[PDB]
Structure 1
Amino acid sequence: MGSSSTQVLVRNATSNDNHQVSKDSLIELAEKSYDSADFFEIMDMLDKRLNDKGKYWRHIAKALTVIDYLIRFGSENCVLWCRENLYIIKTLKEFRHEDDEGIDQGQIVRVKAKELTALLSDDERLNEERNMNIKGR
């Protein structure tokens, strides 16, 4: 316990309410990724969320949404981190979860993981997104 404001930001942005991440949160997390202390707290909490159990699949989905935004709008260090920690992302391409209503929620995790890894393989695409999004990279 005892959180920096960045830690509260990233936790709130990846919490187990609904899988949709606020635009507010994403913009602030991308801005904060350029700060050294913030970057590590952001990436470490994101790693924890990704590693959560199936019941908390919303933690995983939202973490992946945050990671996608970060590599598209955040510090180059976010891309670096992903490549160093690609394994957890890649395994999530096959994550599975059916909820108590019989709904395939795991497909949400799988699509986000598959998008992120596809993007990370597509240097042309990621480079142009980042040039476009980041003034002046």
Structure 2
Amino acid sequence: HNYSEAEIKVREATSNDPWGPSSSLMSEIADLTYNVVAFSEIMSMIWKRLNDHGKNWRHVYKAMTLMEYLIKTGSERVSQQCKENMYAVQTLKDFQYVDRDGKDQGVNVREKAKQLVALLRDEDRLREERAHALKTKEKLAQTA
């Protein structure tokens, strides 16, 4: 069918464009993770966007950025499902992409993957990361 609004938001937040996802858009997606229907659509689209290679690395990098944000500020179900699909996060630590100009863009995906896995496996730390992230999200909504 047509994409749901939640799916459209995830695709925009992970678009193959030279700009990272805005905090405002990620915050909207985070709220939608509490919606039982939207949650599954959101997660599925993120896993799909992470499934890419080489020159399409921005899809992957931005999808990881969004996943990190949702792990920290969305429903606790996000982190739960990421832990259950840990392998799919771990594989990204080996992603490679050096462009035609010889510049290593893939090292960025590898670095973010490494720190994303650490965030998911360090259980005591996740509690503190969520508290700080949620406070940051609250301030975002209370500022222009």
TM-score for the superposition, normalised by structure 1: 0.92
Q: Which amino acid aligns with 2:3?
A: S
Q: Which amino acid aligns with 2:5?
A: S
Q: Which amino acid aligns with 1:20?
A: G
Q: Which amino acid aligns with 1:67?
A: M
Q: How does 1:47-58 map to 2 (within 5 A)?
A: 47-58=47-58
> Are residues 100 and 19 of structure 1, via their aligned partners in 2, closer, same or farther at CA, if it must alter by over 3 Å?
farther
Map of 2:10 onto structure 1: 10
What is the distance in 2 between the residues matched to 1:20 and 1:74? 18
Retained in 2: the 8 A contact 1:57–1:106? yes
User: How well do the aligned residues superpose, as a CA RMSD in angstroms?
Assistant: 1.4
What is the distance in 1 between the residues matched to 2:133 and 2:14? 23
Gaps of 5+ in 2: 136-144
TM-score for the superposition, normalised by structure 2: 0.88
Give how far 1:131 is off: 3.5
> Are residues 105 and 40 of structure 1, via their aligned partners in 2, closer, same or farther at CA, if it must alter by over 3 Å?
same
Give how far 1:134 is off: 4.5
Q: Which amino acid aligns with 1:112?
A: K
What is the distance in 2 between the residues matched to 1:19 and 1:91? 24
Q: How does 1:85-100 map to 2 (within 5 A)?
A: 85-100=85-100
Q: How does 1:17-32 map to 2 (within 5 A)?
A: 17-32=17-32
Query: 1:23-52 CA deviation, whole Å, 9 max, x = no partner?
Result: 111111111111111111110000101111
Give how far 1:19 is off: 4.9
Query: 1:57-104 CA deviation, whole Å, 9 max, x = no partner?
Result: 111001100110011001011011101111111011111100122110
Map of 2:141 onto structure 1: none
The count of corresponding residues between Structure 1 and Structure 2 is 135
SS in 1 for 2:20: coil
Query: 1:105-132 CA deviation, whole Å, 9 max, x = no partner?
Result: 0011011111110111211110122244
Q: Percent identity?
A: 48
Map of 1:126 onto structure 2: 126
SS in 2 for 1:58: helix
Map of 1:73 onto structure 2: 73
Are 1:82 and 2:66 counterparts? no
Give how far 1:5 is off: 0.8
